[PDB]
Structure formats: C-alpha cells, structure tokens
Amino acid sequence: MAVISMKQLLEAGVHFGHQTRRWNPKMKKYIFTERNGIYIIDLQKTVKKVDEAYNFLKQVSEDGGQVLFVGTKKQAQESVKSEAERAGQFYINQRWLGGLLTNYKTISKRIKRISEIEKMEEDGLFEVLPKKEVVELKKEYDRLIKFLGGIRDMKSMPQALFVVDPRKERNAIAEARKLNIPIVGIVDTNCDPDEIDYVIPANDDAIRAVKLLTAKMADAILEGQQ
Amino acid sequence: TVVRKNESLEDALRRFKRSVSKSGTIQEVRKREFYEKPSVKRKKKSEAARKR
Amino acid sequence: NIENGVAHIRSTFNNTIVTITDEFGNALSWSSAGALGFKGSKKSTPFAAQMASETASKSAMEHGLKTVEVTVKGPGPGRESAIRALQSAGLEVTAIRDVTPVPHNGCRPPKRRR
Amino acid sequence: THIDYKDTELLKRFISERGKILPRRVTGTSAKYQRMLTTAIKRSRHMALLPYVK
Amino acid sequence: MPRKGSVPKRDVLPDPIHNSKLVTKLINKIMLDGKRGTAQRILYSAFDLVEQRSGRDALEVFEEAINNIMPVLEVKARRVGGSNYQVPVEVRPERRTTLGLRWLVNYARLRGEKTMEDRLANEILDAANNTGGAVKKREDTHKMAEANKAFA
RNA sequence: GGAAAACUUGAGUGCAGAAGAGGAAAGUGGAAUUCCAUGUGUAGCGGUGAAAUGCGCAGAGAUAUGGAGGAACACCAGUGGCGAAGGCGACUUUCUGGUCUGUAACUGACGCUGAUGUGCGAAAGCGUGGGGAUCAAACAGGAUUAGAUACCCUGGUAGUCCACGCCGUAAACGAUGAGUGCUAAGUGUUAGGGGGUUUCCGCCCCUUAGUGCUGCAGCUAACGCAUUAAGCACUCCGCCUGG
C-alpha cells in the first residue's frame, strides 16, 4: 500500500542499533531503548520517516532527475548496485573518488575516457601496440570501471543522493551540502542526523536491514516516472 | 487465491504448489475421505503431536 | 465476450473434468476425460489432463475467450498437469485459485473402506 | 491486558493468509493469551471485521 | 555378478574390410551355430549387391539403414499388478546399437529368396529407403509405447 | 470410653484474586452436504484391482445466482482445560454448580469412611409424538472368488437428531476404592502467585495445586511401579479363595 508493514520491517532486523558506549546523543529521538549494550531504533517512528522518504523520492523522478546511489560499507557494497540497475540510476560500489560531485570537470574528463578507451580496442589501433602497453591500457580500463563503473553513463550533476552510511561516506555528504543537493540516507547510532535532511533510522550492519530497505527507495522512483 | 503474473506458467506453479501445501486443503480432504470413529482421531491427533 | 473468462477444473480421484466459462459464469465450453475415449480408471492420470484441457479451450470458438484465470476445485492427480497443459493452448493463465469445498465440520462423511 | 474484539490491526496479524488461525506454535504467544485471543477473533468473525475464508 | 553391481563389458575387434566395429558385430549375430567363415562370406557377398543397387559404398549405407531400425522408445514391464504394467522407457545407447542389429537379421530370415546372398541385402536397401519389414515393426513399437504414454 | 473446660493445624465460612469444551435454557452466525426452482451450456456422469448395477437427450453432471431444510461446528486444538463418573469443542445473553491461589478476620473437631437406601450413568434399544440433511443395520441389485449371507459398488428402512418418560448395562479401563500422613532427584506443561528483569511484552528467574515423561531407595512371581506407588503406615467399605 503505502508503508512497509510492521512484520517484515523488523524481520530484516532494523530495530538493532550500535552499541551503548558508542552513542551519538542527537539520535535520542529515534531510539526506543537499549537492551544489552545495544540500542533499539523506534520502529513506529521510522515508519513515520520512511513514508516521508517515499514521498519526495516519488516526485523527484517525476521531474526526470537523477538520484545518485552510494554504498561503500563492505556488507552493503553490492546491495546498492543491483537496486540501481532496477531503478536505472547511477551507483557507487568502491570508495568515494574524492571530487566526483565537486571536481567533476576533471572526472567527466575521464568519463569521456571510458567512453573512448573501450572504443579504442573494439576497432583497430590494437595490433600495432606493444604487448605490455596492451596491459596498461587494460590496467587503466578496469580501474576506471572499478571506481567510476556506475558513473559510466552519467554526464551531469545529480539532483538527489542516497547514502547507506554518513559515517564511512562522510566525503560524499560534505560535497552534498556545498552544492545544496538534497540528501536522504540510512542512519543509526554513530551517525549524525544533522547533515541529512531526509532521515531514515534503520540498522546498518545487516544485509536484510539494507536490502529490504534500500529496495523500496530504489522502487520509489519507478512509479514516479509513469 | 494469489495472482501471479509478469512471469511464465512454470514459475507461477512453484508459488501455487507451496501456497496449497501451506493450507488446510489437501491434508483436510484426505482426512475426510471416510468417517473415522470419534475416539480414534483423538489418538490419531495424539500420534501427530507426540512425534511433532 | 472476447478474451475474458473463468476456467474451472475439478480433478477428483477419477475423471478430471474441465469447464471454461466467462467471468460471470455461463458455461462457454467443457470437456472431460470420458469424452476422449478414456473409458475407466485411465481417467485418473495427468496424461488425461494433457488432452482434456485444451480440447474444451480450443474448441470454444464462439467468442475468442482467450484468457482463463483458472480455478482449482478438486483433489486429484492431474491437478497441476491441467494448467501446465493449458499453456499448450497458450491462453495467458494469470490468476490460479484453489477454491475447493472445505467444510467447517458440517456433515457426516461415509464409512471407512475395508 | 485484555484483547478487545474491535482492535482489528493487532488482531489480524494473528489471522492467517486465508482467514484461519495461526497456532501459538508458529506465532509464539503464551497459553492464556491464545485462548483470550480466540474468543475475540471469533466475535470479530461474527460481525464481519474479519472473514471466515478469503 | 548382476546383483553385486554391473558386469564389466568387454571389447570387440573391428572388421578389416570396412574398418568398422559395427560390421563385426553383424558377423557375430548372423553367425548361426559358431560357423565364423561360412557366415562372414555371406555378409561379404551381401554388401556387394548393396553397392550394386546403389553407387555409394555400403559402410555409409549400413549406418544409414540401421537408423530406420533403431527405435527411441520401448516398453519395460514394471510389476504394478492391476495397473497397465507397461512403462514407456527410452533406450540406453548400448541396447540402442544391439536391438537394431537384432531386427535387421531376424526379418532377413523370412523373405521369399532362400540365399542370404540376397535375403540380407534386400532388407538393408529397404531399411536404407525407410521401408520393408524390419522398419515397420519399429513403427509398431512406436504405435505401442507411444499409445500408452500415461507412464512417462 | 463418659462428663465438665481450653486450644488451633484438620474441616468449614469470610475477605481479595483468578482459570475453565462444568451443566441448563433461549437466541445468533458461517463453510459444507442433500433436494428444489432458474440462467447458460453438451454427452456422458458416477464408481472400481478391473467393471457393472445406477443416473442422463422429459437436458444429467459441470458452472452461476437465489431458496428451503436438517445435522455438525474446520482453523484455534496441545501427553492442554473442566467434571464425581458417563462425559464436555461455533458465538452471545440469562440462570447455576465446583475447584485452585493468597490473606489471615472468624467458628472451634464441626472430621473420615459408609452396609441398606436414594440419585446420575456412553452407545444400542423401547414408549408417546416430532423431525428426517448426511450417514446407515435389515433389505434389493451388480461384481469378485474356488465358494458367500463376508469384503467392494449402486440404492435404501428402522436408527442417527429433538421433547418427555423408560431401560441402567460397556475392555463404564489408570483392567489399580476412598481418606490422611511420611519417603532421592531430574524434567516438560497448566491457572496462577510472585518475582528479578523487562520485552517493544520479551523473557528468564523462585511459588499451591493440577497434568505428563524419565529414575534411586523400597516393592513385585516377572514385566514393571516409583511424591499422580503397585514404597512405608493407620481407618473404613466393596470383593476373591481350582477350571
């Protein structure tokens, strides 16, 4: 219907937080309690946040914008690539390259390269090259699609960004607030909700807590198209 | 009573074969193929509970 | 009347019977296993459902009712082999229901069989 | 507490995916909760807040 | 030992003329009563008439004729009692080779001519042209095992 | 043992909490079965190890809507609950019985067992009427078999159901009468009582009385029983003494 129901939302395990002694005091609003050094994310209130996370992200894609998906935490790397392809948006698996939203007049200089270097060896100009220069032209080729693999077809700035963790991906969020790009993200304990405008309190060190929560936000743009 | 679409028929069966096995239809009508005596089902349910 | 209907199968322990009808049931066409030269006790086979399903579906021909959304109403051996053989006719099976009569312990069933 | 038979939303997580009753083996409730539940689930079947089968 | 496991099957020796294993296995099945030479001479004079009534060499014609003999479904009886007790079962590749050789010879012995000089070669060109008597019982198996298809 | 007093544990009433298919009467409700009426529709349906009897072209079955009627109450449902036993399973209301826990206010042995007696007592029966849906002795017909009156199949009456009187018997069985004490432990579970915690209610912890499964001492002829004795005692009642 509208929201995630109460049964499968806590079956993924999003009520778990991080440890007490590892706590951010600004997250007091979105914590129901702690049981054994572990905090308990207020489950009724994050449903009152994920629908608000569903409301704008519906109508962002109504304008035809491009929402950037980033994920770098090692237990949530490839849970955001498969949901960006179903959404038709642009993903990040590896580390933040350090300027791909801000110094992207030198990053699109190299997105021009990945549109060129694979063209460079499908045609000729490949037999005349030395066999070790074949290697570094291919050792350049994979390392482009390692980091900039999800920014393969992206040629402009985004209009929204979706982060799995503001702690480990703090380089991206600092570039977001300088560009006035709106931001939505999964936060928990050991996360600052101040820099996130559209807050989703959910667990972060579990796969189903990501995958059964990052899929609907990826699904949120598809019925905003038509 | 579950609608299955956007796929083939050999995958809607895989939903439907386990949406019937998790229901009281096949195990219910096999029970009522013949009238059992009103004190032999209390032992039939007891054997179907002590084994679990 | 074109391409809208309800398919009813009820495979019992004998003689898989199929009647396809419209969405407000009015018995468009029907066929059985006995209507295919299966005289007795060969009718309780999935292979009897392999021919009995489409020979009512393809011999409907009065409106071109080419969607079915089948309904199951019987415990039988040729239960799922009558909807598998319905895409041999290829009529976009879109909603499979197991609508079988299950009592709320209402009547006395017949005697045990020795 | 005591289950009221109008409070449908907490009462329909206990109904099945067809209208049957989940046993306390698969739900996990206690003994006296389950039979205080079942006299409220069956007064709500009678006044059409919940079906008998779907 | 057919219940300890399986019997170890043994190797044969291919023919010198055609350089074919399949020819020597045909020699051994037409070898009535252990007479190797008096049966091998007849096969060596029952493919010259094959190569006379068709320009192709008979080692092509042999493996072309047996493909209209070798069936793909047969009947193995399972003791189910009151059921049909006739299950249509596909053929293993070893029995696929053997049972074609069996029908080719067993109906070559029931023709009008007496000499197997031309008893054999007539049924080969019939099997090369998908006709005759050893072909038509393959279709009889393919009208029996393919009629009781309720036991796949 | 008798008489006069005193006591509180036994027994009973209070007060405060619970749990329950404990009964009785009256209402309400849904799925299914059968029959009828109708629409649409066409050759079988049904049944079996195989068939046949039977049903259908006077439209069967199948399908859809509506109706009538009787009987039961899926799921919950569990070596769970309640009752003295038989037994008790939709839901609601009225009327009504018992048990358990806790507190200690109160009565002060008021107790236990119980021949004769007097009442409850599954089913099948019987009577007077109802009602008759399924099921179904007897009965009819078709198959099987070596043979049938058996098994199997189609059909079917009493009965099954209600009301009132009877009958009073069951492997009515835990094949174990009732009462009260005492005697290793371990473990499930029930209504609790507490609890410690809490849980997002989760739980995990000690607590009368129930209800199971293991297992010492002791007992038994042996299997086995073992704080729910078939152990150790005391009271009273029923009963046995070869087939």
Is C80–B13 a contact, with Cβ atoms under 8 angstroms apart? yes
Cross-strand partners of A162: A69, A184
- Return the closest-CA partner of residue A51 out of A217, A221, A174: A217
Q: What is the DSSP string of B16-29?
A: HHHHHHTSSSHHHH
CA atoms within 13 Å, Cβ hemisphere of A119? 6
Resolution in A: 6.8
d(CA E32, CA E30): 6
Shortest Cα distance, chain B CAs vs residue D12, angstroms? 17
B12: chain C residues, CB-CB within 8 Å: 93, 96
E-interface mutation test, from C39, C44, C47, most E Cβ less than 10 A away: C47
Residues 25-84 of C with CB under 7 A from strand F: 25-30, 32-35, 39-41, 43, 71, 73
Q: Is B7 helix (H, G, I), strand (E, B) or coil?
A: coil
Distance B39 CA to F241 C1' (A): 38
d(CA A81, CA A149): 10
E147: chain C residues, CB-CB within 8 Å: none
Q: Where are the alpha helices (DSSP H) in E6-131?
A: 21-30, 37-44, 48-53, 58-65, 93-106, 116-128
Q: How far is CA E13 from CA E28, E64, E66, in A?
A: 11, 22, 20
Distance C95 CA to F47 C1' (A): 33
Under 8 Å between Cβ of E51 and E58: yes
Q: How far is CA A175 from CA A56, A158, A199, A221, C50, in A?
A: 21, 12, 18, 23, 64
Q: What is the largest CA-CA distance in chain D?
A: 29
Residue A174's contacts (CB-CB under 8 Å, 6 or more residues apart) are: A195
Shortest Cα distance, chain C CAs vs residue E38, angstroms? 52
Tokens of B23: 């229901």
Q: Is A68 helix (H, G, I), strand (E, B) or coil?
A: strand
Amino acid (1-letter code) at residue C54: E
Is D54–B1 a contact, with Cβ atoms under 8 angstroms apart? yes
| Structural method | cryo-EM
Using only the alpha carbons of chain E, give its radius of gyration: 17
Tokens of E50: 């094959």
Chains A and E touch (3+ CB pairs under 8 A): no
- Please tell me which chains touch E, using 3 or more CB pairs under 8 Å as the contact test: C
Please give the DSSP secondary-structure letter assigned to residue A40: E
- Return the closest-CA partner of residue A210 out of A3, A8, A1, A13: A13
List the single residue in E with minimal CA-CA distance to C44: E150
Nucleotides of strand F lying closer than 7 angstroms to a protein CB: 19-21, 28-33, 39-52, 61-64, 70-80, 90-92, 133-136, 151-153, 189-192, 198-200, 202-203
Q: For residue E132, how many other CB atoms are within 10 A of its CB?
A: 22
Q: How far is CA A149 from CA A141, A146, E106, in A?
A: 10, 5, 70
C 35-94 residues with CB below 8 A of E? 42, 45-48
Q: Is B40 helix (H, G, I), strand (E, B) or coil?
A: coil
- Please provide residue A28's backbone torsions phi and psi, each rounded to the nearest 5 degrees: -70, -30
B25: chain C residues, CB-CB within 8 Å: 75, 98, 100, 102
- Return the closest-CA partner of residue A101 out of A157, A150, A166, A151: A157
Q: Where are the alpha helices (DSSP H) in A61-132?
A: 81-87, 108-122
Q: How far is CA A178 from CA A66, A81, A182, A195, in A?
A: 18, 26, 11, 11
d(CA A149, CA A224): 25
- Please provide residue A70's backbone torsions phi and psi, each rounded to the nearest 5 degrees: -125, 140
- Please provide residue C46's backbone torsions phi and psi, each rounded to the nearest 5 degrees: -65, -25
Cross-strand partners of A161: A68, A183
